[PDB]
Design a protein around this ligand. Structure first.
Ligand code: MOO
Length: 157
């Protein structure tokens, strides 16, 4: 079992509710497919407001309900991210304009930046901020994440 190494960065505004869920769903898929060793995975924020913070408690419990754990600490997206990751997947059109803006300040930008929801077989393009929502909204984000992450993986696998 030998291949090449792929990397993906999951991105949200704060890296406290959405991307940590995406990122953790993503590792599980990869681990379950016995391909971890070929993947570098990470999650980051457009904003610095919450760096160093743990994931929101409702995101932790949501993942737990699904047999998944995370140990992530929020971090900000940097310019190196644009040259180090194959893919940068974000949650919403805002994250998307924000990143295209930064990447510009990047000379040899080698990351492909897209909406994770662009991979959704159900077509729900956007992954909504569940911050002000309830446990049900966390769950629906998880759900989207699984759909989108399996769809992305079968294609870059
Ligand atoms: O981490 Mo977020 O950008 O509040 O879902």
């Amino acid at each position: 079992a030998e291949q090449v190494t792929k990397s993906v960065l999951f991105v949200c505004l704060g890296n406290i509710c959405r991307s940590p869920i995406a990122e953790a769903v993503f590792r599980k898929l990869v681990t379950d497919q016995n391909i971890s060793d070929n993947w570098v995975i990470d999650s980051g924020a457009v904003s610095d407001w919450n760096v160093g913070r743990s994931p929101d408690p409702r995101a932790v419990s949501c993942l737990r309900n699904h047999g998944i754990n995370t140990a992530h600490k929020a971090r900000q997206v940097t310019k190196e991210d644009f040259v180090t990751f194959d893919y940068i997947l974000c949650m919403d059109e805002s994250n998307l304009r924000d990143l295209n803006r930064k990447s510009n300040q990047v000379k040899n930008c080698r990351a492909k930046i897209e909406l994770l929801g662009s991979y959704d077989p159900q077509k729900q393009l956007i992954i909504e901020d569940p911050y002000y929502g309830n446990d049900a909204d966390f769950e629906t984000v998880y759900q989207q994440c699984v759909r989108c992450c399996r769809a992305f993986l079968e294609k870059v696998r």
